Design a protein around this motif. Sequence first.
Motif, PDB file in Angstrom:
ATOM      1  N   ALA A  91      30.333  86.126   4.136  1.00  0.00           N
ATOM      2  CA  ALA A  91      30.453  84.709   3.707  1.00  0.00           C
ATOM      3  C   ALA A  91      29.353  83.855   4.328  1.00  0.00           C
ATOM      4  O   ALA A  91      29.116  83.928   5.555  1.00  0.00           O
ATOM      5  CB  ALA A  91      31.806  84.183   4.065  1.00  0.00           C
ATOM      6  N   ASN A  92      28.825  82.925   3.569  1.00  0.00           N
ATOM      7  CA  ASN A  92      28.114  81.776   4.158  1.00  0.00           C
ATOM      8  C   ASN A  92      29.014  81.160   5.234  1.00  0.00           C
ATOM      9  O   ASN A  92      30.238  81.064   5.101  1.00  0.00           O
ATOM     10  CB  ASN A  92      27.783  80.829   3.023  1.00  0.00           C
ATOM     11  N   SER A  93      28.376  80.672   6.299  1.00  0.00           N
ATOM     12  CA  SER A  93      29.073  80.180   7.498  1.00  0.00           C
ATOM     13  C   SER A  93      29.843  78.889   7.249  1.00  0.00           C
ATOM     14  O   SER A  93      30.624  78.545   8.149  1.00  0.00           O
ATOM     15  CB  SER A  93      28.081  79.968   8.607  1.00  0.00           C
ATOM     16  N   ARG A 122      37.035  78.467  -0.170  1.00  0.00           N
ATOM     17  CA  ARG A 122      36.534  77.128  -0.482  1.00  0.00           C
ATOM     18  C   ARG A 122      35.419  76.752   0.498  1.00  0.00           C
ATOM     19  O   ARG A 122      35.271  77.333   1.569  1.00  0.00           O
ATOM     20  CB  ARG A 122      37.654  76.092  -0.435  1.00  0.00           C
ATOM     21  N   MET A 123      34.675  75.734   0.067  1.00  0.00           N
ATOM     22  CA  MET A 123      33.624  75.069   0.874  1.00  0.00           C
ATOM     23  C   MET A 123      34.286  74.252   1.993  1.00  0.00           C
ATOM     24  O   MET A 123      35.187  73.429   1.744  1.00  0.00           O
ATOM     25  CB  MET A 123      32.787  74.162  -0.033  1.00  0.00           C
ATOM     26  N   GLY A 124      33.900  74.517   3.225  1.00  0.00           N
ATOM     27  CA  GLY A 124      34.268  73.593   4.320  1.00  0.00           C
ATOM     28  C   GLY A 124      33.291  72.418   4.378  1.00  0.00           C
ATOM     29  O   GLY A 124      32.272  72.390   3.684  1.00  0.00           O
ATOM     30  N   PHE A 163      25.288  85.382   3.397  1.00  0.00           N
ATOM     31  CA  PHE A 163      24.395  84.603   2.526  1.00  0.00           C
ATOM     32  C   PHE A 163      24.034  83.305   3.255  1.00  0.00           C
ATOM     33  O   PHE A 163      24.924  82.519   3.577  1.00  0.00           O
ATOM     34  CB  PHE A 163      25.051  84.284   1.187  1.00  0.00           C
ATOM     35  N   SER A 164      22.768  83.055   3.486  1.00  0.00           N
ATOM     36  CA  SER A 164      22.337  81.906   4.330  1.00  0.00           C
ATOM     37  C   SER A 164      22.169  80.634   3.523  1.00  0.00           C
ATOM     38  O   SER A 164      22.481  79.543   4.069  1.00  0.00           O
ATOM     39  CB  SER A 164      21.055  82.249   5.059  1.00  0.00           C
ATOM     40  N   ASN A 165      21.674  80.662   2.317  1.00  0.00           N
ATOM     41  CA  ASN A 165      21.164  79.457   1.609  1.00  0.00           C
ATOM     42  C   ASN A 165      22.190  78.872   0.643  1.00  0.00           C
ATOM     43  O   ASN A 165      21.998  77.756   0.161  1.00  0.00           O
ATOM     44  CB  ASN A 165      19.882  79.722   0.834  1.00  0.00           C
ATOM     45  N   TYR A 166      23.216  79.638   0.246  1.00  0.00           N
ATOM     46  CA  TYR A 166      24.157  79.221  -0.823  1.00  0.00           C
ATOM     47  C   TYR A 166      25.580  79.566  -0.385  1.00  0.00           C
ATOM     48  O   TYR A 166      25.793  80.485   0.405  1.00  0.00           O
ATOM     49  CB  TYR A 166      23.840  79.995  -2.110  1.00  0.00           C
ATOM     50  N   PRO A 167      26.596  78.887  -0.966  1.00  0.00           N
ATOM     51  CA  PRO A 167      27.990  79.119  -0.583  1.00  0.00           C
ATOM     52  C   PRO A 167      28.649  80.353  -1.244  1.00  0.00           C
ATOM     53  O   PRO A 167      29.648  80.289  -1.928  1.00  0.00           O
ATOM     54  CB  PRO A 167      28.711  77.796  -0.993  1.00  0.00           C
ATOM     55  N   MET A 168      28.044  81.504  -0.932  1.00  0.00           N
ATOM     56  CA  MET A 168      28.344  82.814  -1.556  1.00  0.00           C
ATOM     57  C   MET A 168      29.091  83.724  -0.597  1.00  0.00           C
ATOM     58  O   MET A 168      29.021  83.650   0.639  1.00  0.00           O
ATOM     59  CB  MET A 168      27.063  83.507  -1.993  1.00  0.00           C
ATOM     60  N   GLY A 173      29.941  77.060  -5.000  1.00  0.00           N
ATOM     61  CA  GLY A 173      29.050  75.911  -5.242  1.00  0.00           C
ATOM     62  C   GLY A 173      29.087  74.904  -4.126  1.00  0.00           C
ATOM     63  O   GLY A 173      29.968  74.876  -3.281  1.00  0.00           O
ATOM     64  N   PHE A 174      28.032  74.094  -4.114  1.00  0.00           N
ATOM     65  CA  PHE A 174      27.951  72.923  -3.213  1.00  0.00           C
ATOM     66  C   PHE A 174      28.955  71.873  -3.644  1.00  0.00           C
ATOM     67  O   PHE A 174      29.471  71.883  -4.748  1.00  0.00           O
ATOM     68  CB  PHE A 174      26.518  72.388  -3.125  1.00  0.00           C
ATOM     69  N   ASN A 175      29.175  70.927  -2.736  1.00  0.00           N
ATOM     70  CA  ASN A 175      30.061  69.778  -3.012  1.00  0.00           C
ATOM     71  C   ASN A 175      29.311  68.505  -2.609  1.00  0.00           C
ATOM     72  O   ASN A 175      29.870  67.659  -1.910  1.00  0.00           O
ATOM     73  CB  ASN A 175      31.393  69.945  -2.324  1.00  0.00           C
ATOM     74  N   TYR A 176      28.155  68.283  -3.146  1.00  0.00           N
ATOM     75  CA  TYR A 176      27.404  67.008  -2.975  1.00  0.00           C
ATOM     76  C   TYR A 176      28.143  65.879  -3.674  1.00  0.00           C
ATOM     77  O   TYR A 176      28.025  64.684  -3.236  1.00  0.00           O
ATOM     78  CB  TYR A 176      25.984  67.131  -3.543  1.00  0.00           C
ATOM     79  N   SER A 177      28.845  66.097  -4.772  1.00  0.00           N
ATOM     80  CA  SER A 177      29.462  65.066  -5.626  1.00  0.00           C
ATOM     81  C   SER A 177      30.807  64.598  -5.047  1.00  0.00           C
ATOM     82  O   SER A 177      31.317  63.557  -5.508  1.00  0.00           O
ATOM     83  CB  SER A 177      29.688  65.570  -7.012  1.00  0.00           C
TER      84      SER A 177
HETATM   85  C1  LIG Z   1      24.875  71.088   2.931  1.00  0.00           C
HETATM   86  C2  LIG Z   1      24.693  72.423   3.570  1.00  0.00           C
HETATM   87  N1  LIG Z   1      23.760  72.632   4.487  1.00  0.00           N
HETATM   88  N2  LIG Z   1      23.847  73.945   4.859  1.00  0.00           N
HETATM   89  C3  LIG Z   1      22.964  74.487   5.877  1.00  0.00           C
HETATM   90  C4  LIG Z   1      24.846  74.577   4.178  1.00  0.00           C
HETATM   91  C5  LIG Z   1      25.355  75.893   4.149  1.00  0.00           C
HETATM   92  O1  LIG Z   1      24.861  76.860   4.924  1.00  0.00           O
HETATM   93  N3  LIG Z   1      26.356  76.198   3.337  1.00  0.00           N
HETATM   94  N4  LIG Z   1      26.899  75.261   2.518  1.00  0.00           N
HETATM   95  C6  LIG Z   1      26.457  74.015   2.493  1.00  0.00           C
HETATM   96  C7  LIG Z   1      25.408  73.625   3.324  1.00  0.00           C
END
Ligand SMILES: Cc1nn(C)c2c(O)nncc12
Length: 185
Positions: free
Chosen positions: A17-19, A31-33, A46-51, A169-173
């Motif tokens: 998991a992404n961190s 889910r996205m924290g 996965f470093s760059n995306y919420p995968m 996915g991201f949660n910018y919105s």
């Molecule tokens: C907004 C944002 N920044 N970074 C570094 C993130 C990451 O690793 N995973 N999800 C979201 C992120």
Amino acid sequence: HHHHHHMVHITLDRNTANSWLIISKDRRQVRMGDTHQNVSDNKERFSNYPMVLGAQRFSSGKMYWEVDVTQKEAWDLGVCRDSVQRKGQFSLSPENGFWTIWLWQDSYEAGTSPQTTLHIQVPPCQIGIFVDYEAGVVSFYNITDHGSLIYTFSECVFAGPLRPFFNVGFNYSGGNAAPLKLCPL
Ligand SMILES: Cc1nn(C)c2c(O)nncc12
């Protein structure tokens, strides 16, 4: 479709998991924290995306599972090679070892290179994913619309073991906090 009898019990692999992801105790939801979730780094994440990947590896046979995407604005779903790139930027394509569809900005697309427009009249709340390893097929089904076909990748060159693949996915919105959930059999 009549693929339901190939149903497999998928669980999520925390170590991939992404961190920022939060995986439930039963390893069936993610889910996205709103921050880093206080885990050590490792070469699998996965470093760059919420995968995140499923724990299961498939090298033969027919497999089917379902994912709940209710009220999400963005996500990616499908399968990928066990050896896909984890670090840095990359596109979801069969050349990079991914067989996926996604929702983004109110449109559904298949992760071909370049991407392919999908034609969905009934926005899905649950997606069915079918893999036939020997045939080289990955198919996606709209469970909300009586199982209608969304997309088939055929002539797939898997070239390795497959893992279930997820992107919350991201949660910018502020509108994409909802989880991905593995639906019961
Ligand atoms: C907004 C944002 N920044 N970074 C570094 C993130 C990451 O690793 N995973 N999800 C979201 C992120």
